[PDB]
Each structure stands twice: as C-alpha cells, then as structure tokens.
Symmetry: C3
C-alpha cells in the first residue's frame, strides 16, 4: 500500500541512549513525487526519561536504508517495528521493496568529502516542543541521504538539539509534519 | 470525495468570543493514512475584530465529533458551514460519515485523568503571524482527541495564544499546514 | 500527471539579483483540493553567492501564471526549467494546462487597492535556515495570488527576509513544506 510506519502504539522501538529506550512514532505516506511525513519521539526508559543537567542536549535518530529501501539493522529504529501499514499494525512479510519512499538522490545527494558542505535543501530545520509546552523548544533537524554509515543507499535522520535546561523532565515532543522528494513514482 | 472543509469564502462560521463572530478556514484532505490540513482564522465582529489591552490572548476553537466523524453542535464551528467539498461549496446532504478523517485513537488517545499528562505527540505547536506581519507571532497549538466535552468520540482543537500587545488590531492569521494520522484508510 | 516541478538538479533557473544566478528547487504535488509544496533556494553566482554587509536582506521570487496555469516569462523562474514531471526530468511539450495546481481565487483573492490590506490567510510565514545552520534564520513568506504584475491570473511568491549579518556566506536555505487550496479538483 502507500504508508510505511512504526505503528501508532507506545511499544519501545528506538535508541536515544540505549536499545529500545524510546518510541519513535514515524509515518511516511506516499503522495506521488513526495512523501508526507509525520514524526515524534518519546523516551520511555534511561537517561532521556528523566534528564539531568549533564544529559547531552543532542540526539540523532538514524534510519539507514539499503538499495531496496529496506531498513539496515545498524539503524537507531528496530527493524521488527517498521513496515508497510495494515489496520493499526504492520504487514507480516518483513522484506518489502520501498524505493518509492526513499529520498531522491538528485535532490539529496550523498556527501562528497572535499566540499565538506552539501546543499542546504538536504535538511529541514524547525522547532518542536518538549512536553507540548510552548516555552520548551527543541530544534528538529531532518536530513536526507547525508549518512555514509554501513554502506547505506539512502538515509533519513532526525536530530533533536536544545539549549534550555530540561533536567527532571521526560523527553517527549510534539508532532512534526514534513515532506521530501522521492526516488521513484 | 476526499476533502472536508469550511469552504474558502469569508461568511462567518465560528465563535472566538460570540456566535459567528469569526471565519475559520479549515480544509482536511485525505491522503491515505494521513490527513493534510490547512487552517486560518479571522475575526469579523466582536472583541477580536478590534482587540484591547485586556482582550484574552488565548482563543480555543473546538471541533468535537461523534463516533461517525460528524461535528457536534456544541463545537465552536457551525455545523451548517462544514461538509464534504463540491466545486467551491459543500454537498447538500448534512450527515455524511467521516471516520476516515478522524484522528487515530491509538496515536492520539483520549486523556485518562490520573496521569493528567498525555503523550506530547497529541499536539502540534508552531507560530502563525497576525496580520501576516513577521514581527507578530501567535502560537498555534493543534490538539487531537484531547477533549471530553459532550461525549465526543474525536476532537481537533486549534488554540491561538500570544504575549505581545495587539490592541487596536483585527485578529487575522497566516495559514498553517499540518498532518495527522487517521482512524481509517 | 500530478507533479509540477523545477526538477531536483542544480542547473540555475531563477533570478535573485541577475538572470539565472540561482537554483529554485520547487515541487508542487496535487493532493485533491490541496497542493503539497516543497521549496528551497540556492545562489550559484552574483551578489547572493557571496553576500556583503550591504546586500539587501529581502529577496522576492515571483511565479506569475496565466489563466491556463502556465508560467509567464516575466516570472523570476525560467519557463524552460518548469513543467510536469517525467522520471527526474520534465515533459517535452511546453504549454500544458495547470489550473488544478493554481491557488484558489476564493481562498486567496487578488488585492482590491482600497482596503490595501487583504486576508492574512493569503500568506504563510515561517523560518528556514541559511547554510542549514540552526542559528541563521531566514524568514520565508509565501503569498498566493497577491501579484498584479503583467495581467497574471494567479501568482505564488516566495520572499526571503532576514536581519542577521550573513556577509561572506552563500545564500542557501533548508527546505520548506507547505500546502494551499487549489482552483480545481
Ligand atoms: C511556539 C514558540 O515560538 N515558542 C517560543 C517561546 C514563546 O514565544 C514564549 O514562551 C511566549 O511567547 O519563546 C521562547 O523563547 C521560549 O520559550 O523558549 C522560544 C520558543 O520557541
Ligand atoms: C518569522 C519569525 O520568526 N518572526 C519572529 C520575529 C523576527 O525574527 C524579527 O521580527 C525580525 O527578524 O522576531 C520575534 O521576536 C517577533 O518579532 O516577535 C518573534 C517572531 O516569531
Ligand atoms: C531553529 C531555531 O529556532 N533557531 C533559532 C536560534 C536557536 O534557538 C538558538 O541558536 C539556539 O537555541 O535562535 C535564534 O535567535 C538565532 O539563532 O538566530 C533564532 C533562530 O530561529
């Protein structure tokens, strides 16, 4: 069908600090040339569930994909928790081609180490809000195809950075809508 | 078809302070698993048409829906002004099922009074701009399924909050794009 | 098909200061009642490729369309670089009707000179980031049908304004997602 997602439940599927300490809620809906994306992140256990003054205010969630658009196991997100939608769940077969969901490699080329400075269009930068409190911004940076980790063909990364002291709080952010150009259609 | 909307005209349809003092422009377009939403709000009469120093800088527009996805009459938005699109208008039959437009209850569960602190992913927080002037932010908070008013099955609320003194101005904001996960597909 | 775009390559197609000094990357995907848009801008040559302290911190990119939704040659964007998608390129026939991609004239009416103050819903205002650096905001203002230049039927303009001193840098911004109501469906 035309949605890849994590499912909308709260079962931990992602690494912020340690394995499966967090729930990434990510939905990618194919709209022709573009994917319409929706993302949020919640810490369920570990450091980011009850932050301290020294907790690093920078968290990168990496989704690395192979040439078939299939998630690599070195990704932050667990493979078992990511697939095509069926009802409120995911399909049973694990290895379904997803090239039409991948970010376009002409729009968003892989880095070349010389320039060490790619096109800014490879990123989206905005704010989401910790605890859904309007005075608690967290910068979200979405980057397309900027990883080289583990021979990936494509990548989507979500980086959350902040400056304010959110010690004693649970990391949880508002939802963010975005789009990107796809490899196929 | 695949759009629910208010129509794009300027005929008042909504309550900010009193009945039908304002035009909510809202379009919900079904894109599979997600709705693509577009919203703006204009005060046509009453307090928010010519604000004062004491006008409350917090306005909640509530859309409450029943189990069929049909707007409840206790909503801020008038029933008569909300339906499936036809041309630049709305269809003639008033009571059309709209469950596929409703926010997903697994992604966006109704509150349980104990925790008194739901998932932050149930909200979207950003800024729109009063008068389309870049120095006049208004915080927009969109919340999914967080109301319990009048036995609603689903809800979408738009809250506009601000801190700057917009006395002597008409409330009118720029358009805001968003998406959310739907109950069905 | 259902995408109008510039293509995702880096071949200059647009005027910031002089002809074809910049690459506008713009994709418009038809989703029923709405277009899902994605935009970014890069200066390849001229003033905006290496800004100075006096470079004007205001750049308007104008797309003017005729009654058939076809770009007028007085637009900032070159005609030769804009058309319906095929693969990663554009179709061969140059003059394809695109009314279903045009911004809705009821939602976004042309100005009437008296009020000299249209509906704020005709604009979207947010920030994108120069160099994809989180401390370098650039205000993006998208306006629908607000031009009268050259007898246009429709218009979409992208204005980039800023206040910080970005001297010695290349103008290049992060991607921005938006939507608008269309004339037809
Ligand atoms: C939605 C939004 O823009 N929130 C912003 C808030 C609000 O403007 C003020 O709390 C009240 O207006 O101000 C900040 O300085 C803050 O609190 O950290 C930045 C933050 O991004
Ligand atoms: C689009 C945007 O971000 N606008 C912001 C403006 C501009 O940054 C400055 O007016 C000029 O740069 O600054 C604010 O402090 C303001 O005016 O209230 C917050 C507001 O949200
Ligand atoms: C994504 C975002 O909101 N960036 C904002 C940054 C960051 O908040 C701080 O650099 C660190 O938090 O602050 C600004 O004052 C700035 O740098 O110009 C406004 C800018 O829009």
């Amino acid at each position: 069908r035309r949605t890849l997602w994590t499912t909308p439940d709260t079962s931990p599927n992602c690494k912020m600090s340690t394995e499966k300490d967090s729930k990434l809620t990510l939905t990618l809906t194919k709209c022709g040339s573009q994917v319409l994306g929706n993302v949020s992140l919640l810490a369920v256990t570990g450091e980011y569930h009850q932050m301290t003054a020294t907790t690093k205010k920078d968290v990168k969630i990496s989704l690395l994909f192979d040439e078939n658009g299939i998630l690599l196991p070195s990704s932050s997100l667990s493979k078992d928790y990511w697939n095509y939608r069926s009802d409120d769940s995911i399909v049973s077969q694990k290895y379904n081609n997803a090239v039409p969901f991948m970010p376009n490699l002409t729009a968003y080329p892989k880095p070349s180490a010389q320039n060490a400075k790619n096109y800014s269009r490879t990123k989206i930068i905005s704010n989401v809000y910790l605890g859904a409190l309007t005075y608690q911004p967290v910068i979200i940076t979405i980057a397309f195809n900027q990883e080289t980790e583990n021979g990936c063909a494509y990548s989507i990364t979500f980086t959350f950075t902040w400056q304010k002291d959110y010690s004693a709080q649970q990391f949880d952010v508002t939802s963010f809508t975005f789009s990107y150009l796809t490899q196929e259609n």
